[PDB]
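Consortium newsletter contribution from the modelling node. Members have asked for a concrete example of what our holo predictions look like. Here is one, prepared for the 2-acetamido-2-deoxy-beta-D-glucopyranose complex that several groups have been discussing at recent meetings.
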Amino acid sequence: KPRIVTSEEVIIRESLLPVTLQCNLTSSSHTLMYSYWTRNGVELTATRKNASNMEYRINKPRAEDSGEYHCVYHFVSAPKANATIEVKAAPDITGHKRSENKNEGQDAMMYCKSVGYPHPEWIWRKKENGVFEEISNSSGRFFITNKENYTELSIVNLQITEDPGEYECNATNSIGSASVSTVLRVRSHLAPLWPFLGILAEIIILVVIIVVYE
Amino acid sequence: MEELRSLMELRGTEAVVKIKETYGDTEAICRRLKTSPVEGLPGTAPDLEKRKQIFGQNFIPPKKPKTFLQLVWEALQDVTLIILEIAAIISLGLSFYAGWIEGAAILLSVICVVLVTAFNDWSKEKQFRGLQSRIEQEQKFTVVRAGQVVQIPVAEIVVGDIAQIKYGDLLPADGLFIQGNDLKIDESSLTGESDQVRKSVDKDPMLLSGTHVMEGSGRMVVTAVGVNSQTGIIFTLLSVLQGKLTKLAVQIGKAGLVMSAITVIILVLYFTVDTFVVNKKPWLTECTPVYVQYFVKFFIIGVTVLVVAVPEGLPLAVTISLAYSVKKMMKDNNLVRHLDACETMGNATAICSDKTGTLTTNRMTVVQAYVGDVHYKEIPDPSSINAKTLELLVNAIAINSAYTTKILPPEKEGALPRQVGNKTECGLLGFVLDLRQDYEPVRSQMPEEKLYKVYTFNSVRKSMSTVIKMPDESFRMYSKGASEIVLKKCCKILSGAGEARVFRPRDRDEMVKKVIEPMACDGLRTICVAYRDFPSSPEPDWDNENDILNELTCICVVGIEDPVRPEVPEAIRKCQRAGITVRMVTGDNINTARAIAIKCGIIHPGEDFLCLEGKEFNRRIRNEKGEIEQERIDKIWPKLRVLARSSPTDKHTLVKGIIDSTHTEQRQVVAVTGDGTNDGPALKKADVGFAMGIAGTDVAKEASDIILTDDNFSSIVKAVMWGRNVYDSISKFLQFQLTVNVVAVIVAFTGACITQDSPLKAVQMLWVNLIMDTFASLALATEPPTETLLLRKPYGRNKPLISRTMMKNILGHAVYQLTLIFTLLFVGEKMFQIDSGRNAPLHSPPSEHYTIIFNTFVMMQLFNEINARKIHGERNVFDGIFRNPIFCTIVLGTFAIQIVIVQFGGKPFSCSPLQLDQWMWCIFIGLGELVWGQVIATIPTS
Ligand SMILES: Nc1ncnc2c1ncn2[C@@H]1O[C@H](COP(=O)(O)OP(=O)(O)NP(=O)(O)O)[C@@H](O)[C@H]1O
Ligand SMILES: *[C@@H]1O[C@H](CO)[C@@H](O)[C@H](O)[C@H]1NC(C)=O
Ligand SMILES: *[C@@H]1O[C@H](CO)[C@@H](O)[C@H](O)[C@H]1NC(C)=O
Ligand SMILES: *[C@@H]1O[C@H](CO)[C@@H](O)[C@H](O)[C@H]1NC(C)=O
Ligand SMILES: *[C@@H]1O[C@H](CO)[C@@H](O)[C@H](O)[C@H]1NC(C)=O
Ligand SMILES: *[C@@H]1O[C@H](CO)[C@@H](O)[C@H](O)[C@H]1NC(C)=O
Ligand SMILES: *[C@@H]1O[C@H](CO)[C@@H](O)[C@H](O)[C@H]1NC(C)=O
Ligand SMILES: [Mg+2]
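And here is the predicted structure:
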């Protein structure tokens, strides 16, 4: 089994200093053909050379870059040697819906897609008189699906009395936490009726004035 | 083009001798042309078509109109559109360093506008052309084809046609004189010499196109027509309201310019100060393109303010109104030769008219007779007359009157008999027929040869006489006179049992008071019929007609009445109600003129109005030496209602005296209704001159601005109404457009001061510009007139365009719209619960907030377009809305296009689809516009 010595883990802060990750193939009796850096199982471009020792320099380290880096070694007749260098960062939400407008008795969907490593545990909160209390799945009409970097909250058969409010995704991990919020609005089925009554009142008063004065 | 073109060049007696050398006489010319002789013309269609193509030419120059592509090319070259296009091109190019969807949109929108505007022009000019065509159709000339005398358009005259020439006619083509009587022509239009040339076969048979037939009658054969004519050679080889509107246009334009510049500079300054000074940011030229993008957007919005602020097409609107009124005016019997005289008719403050034809139907009938020393208010029975005097009376009337005046049979559809010739003569003939006799046998016993001494009727003598040699060894003289000239001359009366009683001054003075004066007071022209006997003297000296027309014997006295038209009393009442005084100019004696004027209502019985004659008028206006002085005229004209026994130049004197007097506080605008051969100059001195179409000389029609096709005074009133309408239409259009550009501009500026963008984007602003300029002008400038326009005094020349009520409406409706739009722009997020589109980042998607603002703006503008139709504080807005289909079509089409724009086509127009609730709310605000209009209509302006 080949021996690989790797650099220590690095926590990406707001500092702009470049970060270098190192792998050294200290013991190998096999003929090496090549080696390559990968992140989350994705090959990194232009990282295939002789490279008996691997260096990766990141000039502007950011939260989006942190991940599970691997330096894989491939030989003639020996299994590839992967090793592991893990880079952590605070979580941060990239995209989220500003508002959700749906008619009553319909389906509502919200999501908070974020980035970072470790993958953040996702919890949803609802505004209750100024304090973000937890969401209660009492009626069985809330459905929360959690993934690595994605979360999805779905509501079915919207009721105009309880659902309208503001919902937050808290997104915690081992470095920090990051939360954003969304506003949900439920529209009644009787909305068009009131302006129609206003129009009728306008027409009748207009007709009354015109007829009376002439 | 043939030798006939070279035939012209008489200049004395060259043409006659040239004909005698080359052709022989005129008969050889007639047979050379393959044309039937004086009897008639073949008139066969293929032959006339062929000789129209090859022998002559259509008597119409083409005048060369323009095309549509030239119109769009001229519309495209507007400077501000070029600025907008280059800004859009820069933005589109820089967006690549889907933002392009903005810039491209602008370009396409521009290509739309420069189309529609161009189309508008191509429409309105078309209308004008149509009118001109109709004018060319009303010009007709009398020709002889297939032995029949028919009227054909002047454009149909071809070489070889036999054209009949009457006095007052305008010669349409170059021709040869064949036969006629005492034909005198004025050739001042080609030689500059204003004397009447006498045309005869043996001296000068040339007739030139464009000359005026001054006297006589005859026939001619056409030789040269069109560009080949003499007058065609010279043709070849070579507004208060508009001026007052232009100043308003330029003032508003410069105000909009300075406002747009201020907006652009304040945006640039605030953006730079905030981005650099406060939030300290390095230049970082690597990211420098974004900065300039932020500038370019600003620049674009500045331009979109300017195109809305400057009124383009404001002074043009007047013409549009005319282009959609003139045709309809033709259905009220007003053919408009000069369009400038239309709106001038709105300001008319005096009308000078002539009695016969205009106010009286010219249908002369006899209703009173005095024959037999017994007044007869009704036509007597033929047996009830005195013995043996009826034969003498009918003989005198038949032989005396010209034999050409033949009363045509009443073969018209259930109509009165048609009268041809002198009206007095044919009236007396009808009176003779009314007594149950027939002048046809008496006229058949006497051809023209037997009569040997006839004095042609002329206005100097006011009488006409003839001499007959039938009695053996004697002569008999028959005379008809004005009943004032000849009553002095007669020395005996045939009365009683037929024996002559000696007439004396003593009983003459009382008989003039008994019958003649009341006869005139009943509005009856008085004509006296008399005779005399000449014995077989060695030689009666007919040359000294002063003594020959004396010692007659009065056969009878007859009254003739031309009834006043039924419409002209009410028409004159309506004219006087609208502040337009009316005067009458006539050639009758003062009694009959005064009676007819009282009948028409021109002069009330108990009023102080002068009814002085022509001779007294001339004597008064030239008291000092023998020249006309304005100060002397200044006393007569203000109270001159009826002018009788006038002369052709008296009308011109009166017209100029009224038109150029400085005595009145307000400048006077006169409108003379003359019609005559010698009535040319007067029509040119007055502001607008009316001519008569049914019975009018071509010379009178040539110099007139408007032609009345019914020969009725009432139609004149119509003209006034139409003229006033034009002014009103402009006003209401000006009431709408201004309001829009008072709101839009302000809104943009206010946005520019608080937010960093305007709620109305570029293409939306181009849509609003299209609504406010073209569609608004078509909808509002073309409004049908109403009779109520005749209930206000004529407007002065100096008066502001924007009145008090117009400005009150502008301010009030702008206030309402501004309040609603500001309230929406600042609190819509909470009123509708739709989030807030304010401070949107660059390249952001459209939001519902700004779409609601834009939609409610357009709806308020449409309902204000409905409100704009009433200027004079009228409460009932919907009065007569279905009389104008263009208004309804335009408003509903704009509504439908708005519904399509808001829902579909969202990204290019910066719009997002709206639900039903928000649409109903927008329409609710739109109707609140009308409610607030009714609210503001109750505020007293004074
Ligand atoms: N055939 C005639 N014989 C004799 N006298 C005539 C004849 N016809 C008209 N008169 C008279 O002679 C004068 C000619 O006037 P005329 O030119 O016909 O009209 P006016 O009196 O000038 N009025 P107006 O038609 O309005 O211009 C008048 O006094 C007539 O009454
Ligand atoms: C790791 O490899 C680099 C690159 O060759 C080398 O400079 C460094 O000394 C190596 N470190 C160790 C501990 O082997
Ligand atoms: C690099 O080259 C050296 C020297 O030939 C060799 O021993 C080693 O296996 C190579 N490594 C590769 C090709 O990855
Ligand atoms: C390398 O091999 C190990 C074997 O345990 C595996 O866990 C790891 O995921 C591999 N690396 C990659 C990048 O697949
Ligand atoms: C999350 O991780 C998956 C791994 O397959 C990747 O495809 C996706 O782009 C990542 N980001 C988001 C926002 O889901
Ligand atoms: C809520 O309860 C319902 C009960 O039917 C269940 O289907 C659903 O998954 C629950 N959701 C959560 C987030 O617990
Ligand atoms: C997520 O939850 C933490 C832990 O309670 C809370 O304090 C915080 O407000 C949330 N995160 C953010 C970034 O607000
Ligand atoms: Mg006359």
